[PDB]
Amino acid sequence: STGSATTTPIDSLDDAYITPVQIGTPAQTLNLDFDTGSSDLWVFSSETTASEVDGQTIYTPSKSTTAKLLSGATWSISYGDGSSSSGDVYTDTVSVGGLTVTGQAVESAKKVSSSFTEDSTIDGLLGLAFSTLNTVSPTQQKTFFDNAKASLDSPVFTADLGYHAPGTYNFGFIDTTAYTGSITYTAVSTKQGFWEWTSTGYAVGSGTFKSTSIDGIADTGTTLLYLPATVVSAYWAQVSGAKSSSSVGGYVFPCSATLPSFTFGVGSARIVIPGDYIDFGPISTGSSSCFGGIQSSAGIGINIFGDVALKAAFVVFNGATTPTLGFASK
């Protein structure tokens, strides 16, 4: 089997992407944030504290003839930005782009943090990291991909995120029309539960490539590119007036700037992030100070190849017995 679904930016900055997901019988379609940096599929629901729902579409398990309470199971998750959610668990039929999993754990939120409430466009998360990170207790549950894998034509999914435009998540096949040149595959460590790999270096604009190993994660659920302070300083030094602002929480730059590109290495291959992908717009409405899309990972404790990086590539998440990651230009 295969599946193919369009993923759409939630706003004009590509702050996140949402993908429609069918849950239950009859189908209830929710728009979920596909997140290769976590492993829980959770949704706003009829169980979510009423004051914490503000415009989201909810899953109502009592209206699904295939929903079953997973007795005694609870979940609770916190993300790197301090947001959180928790609740109980159902199993139900879940379909993405025509690919169907029966008995998928659907984690129903009883509580969500304010940031979720305040974002009406995201109805929940669909985790695509390794199932070892799943938070369900006392019996850990599998991700949608883990459950689908054996049925897929090939045990892979691909992320093809758009810049200020829709893109595609495919399951079970590689669309050879969706990228240019060849796909370069690179090793993955699953030791921390992530799609963790080592970039071979970087360049800023038309500058020379610096060969250096950068261990980090491929994370569709993180907006920005978080890299070591040395690398980030080298990038922003090429933008007149750019500075790190403790009050804003990262590098800012004059909105009048033209940003240089940023290249990252995948083995001997190179992925080029155009400068415009690194512009996250005014820090507050009407400001002429703009927020940068490349930020320091210092104090996160991990480098993150988030959407800024991934949207410059066609990315293969290869879930073979020994997982690997592939990157192609597009």
| CATH code of 236's domain | 2.40.70.10
The CA distance from 102 to 169, in Å, is 20
What is the experimental method?
X-ray
**Pick from 130, 150, 174: which residue ends a domain?**
174
Name the catalytic one among 35, 119, 146, 279.
Answer: 35
User: Residue 114: which residues within 8 A CB-CB, separation 6 or more?
Assistant: none
**Pick from 128, 153, 174: which residue ends a domain?**
174
The CA distance from 17 to 21, in Å, is 13
Whether residue 322 is found in the same domain as residue 186? yes
For 229, phi then psi, to 5°, come to -55, -35
Question: Could you give the number of structural domains in the chain?
Answer: 2
DSSP state of 31: E
Closest-CA residue to 28 (of 49, 58, 62): 58
Which resolution, in Å, applies to this structure? 1.1
DSSP string, 146-215: HHHGGGSSSSEEEEE--SSS-EEEEES---TTSSSS-PEEEE-B-TTSS-EEEEEEEEETTSPPEEEEEE
Name the catalytic one among 39, 95, 199, 261.
Answer: 199
Whether residue 253 is found in the same domain as residue 149? no
Whether residue 213 is found in the same domain as residue 144? no
Sign, Cα dihedral of 167, 172, 177, 178:
positive
Burial letters 206-226, b for 16+ CB under 10 A, else e: eeeebeeebebbbbbbbbbbb
- Burial tier of 191 (Cβ tally within 10 Å: 0-12, 13-18, 19+): exposed
Whether residue 259 is found in the same domain as residue 123? no
Domain enclosing residue 258, as ranges: 175-330
**Pick from 120, 147, 174: which residue ends a domain?**
174
Whether residue 167 is found in the same domain as residue 204? no
Please indicate whether residue 199 is annotated as part of the active site. yes
* Secondary structure (3-state) at 311: coil
Whether residue 127 is found in the same domain as residue 28? yes
Please identify which residue in the block is written with the tokens 């599998």. Answer: 142
Let me know: does 279 contact 265? Beta carbons within 8 Å.
no
Whether residue 194 is found in the same domain as residue 154? no
Whether residue 301 is found in the same domain as residue 220? yes
* Secondary structure (3-state) at 117: helix
Please indicate whether residue 35 is annotated as part of the active site. yes
